[PDB]
Scaffold this active site. Structure first.
Site, PDB file in Angstrom:
ATOM      1  N   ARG A  95       0.862  -1.212   0.000  1.00 57.59           N
ATOM      2  CA  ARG A  95       0.000   0.000   0.000  1.00 57.59           C
ATOM      3  C   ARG A  95       0.889   1.249   0.000  1.00 57.59           C
ATOM      4  NH1 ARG A  95      -1.054  -0.667   5.566  1.00 57.59           N
ATOM      5  NH2 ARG A  95       1.086   0.116   5.358  1.00 57.59           N
ATOM      6  N   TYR A  96       2.117   1.129   0.511  1.00 59.11           N
ATOM      7  CA  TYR A  96       3.024   2.302   0.613  1.00 59.11           C
ATOM      8  C   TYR A  96       3.843   2.466  -0.669  1.00 59.11           C
ATOM      9  CZ  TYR A  96       2.236   2.819   5.666  1.00 59.11           C
ATOM     10  OH  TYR A  96       1.681   3.041   6.902  1.00 59.11           O
ATOM     11  N   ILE A  97       4.185   1.361  -1.332  1.00 55.50           N
ATOM     12  CA  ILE A  97       5.057   1.440  -2.498  1.00 55.50           C
ATOM     13  C   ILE A  97       4.225   1.530  -3.770  1.00 55.50           C
ATOM     14  CG2 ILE A  97       6.882   0.219  -1.276  1.00 55.50           C
ATOM     15  CD1 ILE A  97       6.139  -2.309  -2.654  1.00 55.50           C
TER      16      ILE A  97
END
EC number: 5.6.2.2
Lengths: 421, 421
Positions: A95-97
């Site tokens: 979800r962050y990358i």
């Protein structure tokens, strides 16, 4: 099922079916725009839309496996976020990358529409994609299938390109150099195996600085498998002085660790005790075509047989270009000729109806075949300069037709290597 | 702000701005397909997309307020799920229930595109919609605004249609019958107020069966405000024997509750003690146009002034139909005439260029105006039978032009009432 569709990649595309899913989902998200990035959690969701059925967290692990650059000499997916380096082998959450199709991917993966269809009809990716250079052995991968195992080490790029440039006229096999990304040591090929040797420097008599460690050692495993057993046995005292884009270890020798006065014996004792030699055996065997395992030596024979397969595709595209240029020639010649016939008034259209005009143009075979565009002509087309323009288009399609008839596969491949910027 | 845009409805559409939001969100969801239903939680989310700004749970309450049929003689929204009846006055959650635009809504809400624009430009619904019959007083609604209050009781439909059929030639006002849905009692209009009288039957001397209760009484409030005070005072013993689509109460008179020997006095005592007479005062006053309160009597004067407003819209649509039929007549006549001119060859197009042909067709004013379609003509159009077809289209648009010139508003309104199936 895992021997053919889950674990071990292919020759041509150079990727596993899960890796084909992740690059196809990256391309499908980038269908709107190339230069925008896409969250890899959405990619792990959309590979199941493409047909991935082994858990989306495994797709997150694969996205970390291609999205990093420390295990990839020839990267193909642009990443935004925290992915790691040679230091840490784990990326962040999906979800962050963010991930997107790279410029290098379009530099290598052209003419992908001639890919033969997958046996799984629910797989929107076909059986194997068509790049210009295969990457099954250019990056290095580990895979264990039911009764089989493979471990693959990456090698060079430009010297391999020189080897294929020699191979297109039929020369001998060139042995490449085993090159790893962000690697500063040495690789020496002895009896089939490869000794990977990290760089260690004698800063003084009892002090040492280490800048390179083997690929089986990250920060944590080189601390826990080398530095901690040497520390607990009363041998050395280690200090972690690594950088963001490199390695570094400051080692002070204690008095119990004896150093040999001969440089060769002391070098062998240090290099064996510190584990900086990794004796790797690259298992080159991997699937060709529709699921058959094949043993090779390096990247060179891989791209040799890739070129030999690719020549048939370029011959097919040459024949299809000949067909479409001859077709567009005869269509545009029928344009200019029917326009000239109604400029001179040799074909009367006025005072008439639909079916009588169709039966009138049915007596001339070219006009009979191409009514549906010749009746589609506008009052734009009812002019002499547009007759000259469409005759020019017919002449251009004719000269392109003999251009595709007189061209060859090999000169086309050299041209296709020529715009690689 | 609440006196004009939150609480009290309008004449023409017959709905509040929040109710305009919920019907517009139902229509916007049903833009893909009419016959499919839509979750009312999504509707309460999308009214804020249309511009509702008083909480989506209030939109859920409004969706329950129109989605039910026990407070609506003339229903306009089809519902799927649990909504209730005359028994319970509360629907289910908005996630569980679904709503869609009904067939009755398209039976009443035609020519809605001529709605004058709302003063709020962020309101995608305009100021007031255009149905064929207004429903501000056909359904009944309660509303308290800043310094003002209104309570509205529904009435009949077909007798009101007969009243408007009398009113279109200018007759007197017909007093309707105050009709409520799922109501089995009686409504008697005395001194402006209305006595609503439920049905109660003497099954024996000391036993009674009740089938109808007033609209201020559901199950719970008729138990707690009538049956429980009569039970706790030692008067009656009640039993709840209601049905799914009706009411029922079995009352056994105890010995302390004296019954009069005269039927009128005993009937008055029972009918006063059981609360089955509701003396309601309908407050008819509600907004006309852009926020002005207006006092009326019943639905009849409402639909009278609705017809008087609607006549201007039908006159405008008659004038616009005249304009578009005359325009399509002259465009199709220019089609057939220019085709006939190039059948006979009186206008030369070949051997020429663009700007010379535009200046050539500029000398004839109809052709000068309609170059852009006459140059848009195909080789389809370069025939005689298509000249006859486009002359037939010009003749059809001409006969429709005198048809819209000779038509009237009132005969059109009778025709529009005629396809109400």
């Amino acid at each position: 099922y895992t021997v053919e569709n889950r674990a071990i990649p292919n020759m041509i595309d150079g990727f596993k079916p899960v890796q084909r899913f992740v690059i196809a989902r990256a391309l499908d998200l980038a269908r709107g725009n190339k230069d925008k990035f896409h969250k890899l959690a959405s990619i792990a969701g959309g590979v199941a839309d493409l047909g991935y059925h082994h858990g989306e967290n495994s797709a997150q692990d694969a996205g970390a496996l291609m999205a990093n650059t420390w295990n990839n000499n020839f990267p193909l997916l642009d990443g935004q976020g925290n992915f790691g380096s040679r230091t840490v082998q784990k990326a962040a959450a999906s979800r962050y990358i963010f991930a997107r199709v790279s410029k290098n991917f379009y530099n290598v993966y052209k003419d992908t529409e001639y890919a033969p269809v997958h046996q799984d009809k629910e797989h929107i990716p076909p059986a194997f994609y068509l790049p210009i250079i295969p990457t099954v052995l250019l990056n290095g991968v580990s895979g264990i299938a039911t009764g089989y195992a493979t471990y693959i080490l990456p090698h060079s790029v430009s010297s391999v390109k020189k080897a294929v440039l020699q191979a297109l006229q039929g020369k001998k096999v060139t042995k490449p150099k085993v090159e790893f990304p962000e690697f500063r040591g040495e690789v020496v090929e002895i009896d089939g195996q490869y000794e990977i040797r990290g760089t260690y420097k004698f800063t003084s008599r009892t002090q040492m600085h280490i800048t390179e460690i083997p690929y089986k050692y990250d920060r944590e495993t080189y601390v826990s498998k080398i530095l901690d057993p040497l520390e607990n046995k009363g041998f050395i005292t280690w200090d972690d002085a690594c950088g963001e884009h490199g390695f570094g270890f400051k080692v002070k020798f204690r008095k119990e660790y004896s150093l040999s006065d001969n440089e060769e014996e002391r070098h062998a004792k240090i290099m064996k005790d510190f584990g900086l030699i990794e004796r790797r055996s690259q298992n080159i065997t991997v699937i060709n075509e529709k699921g058959k395992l094949q043993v090779y030596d390096n990247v060179v024979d891989l791209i040799k047989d890739f070129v030999e397969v690719r020549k048939t595709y370029v011959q097919k595209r040459i024949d299809n270009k000949i067909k479409e240029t001859e077709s567009a020639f005869r269509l545009a010649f029928a344009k200019a000729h029917f326009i000239k016939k109604v400029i001179s008034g040799e074909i009367v259209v006025q005072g008439k109806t639909r079916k009588e005009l169709t039966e009138e143009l049915s007596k001339i075979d070219m006009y009979s075949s191409y009514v549906d565009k010749l009746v589609g002509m506008n009052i734009f087309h009812m002019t002499s300069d547009e007759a000259k323009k469409l005759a020019e288009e017919a002449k251009a399609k004719k000269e392109e037709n003999e251009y595709w008839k007189t061209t060859d596969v090999v000169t086309e491949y050299t041209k296709d290597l020529e715009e690689i910027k």
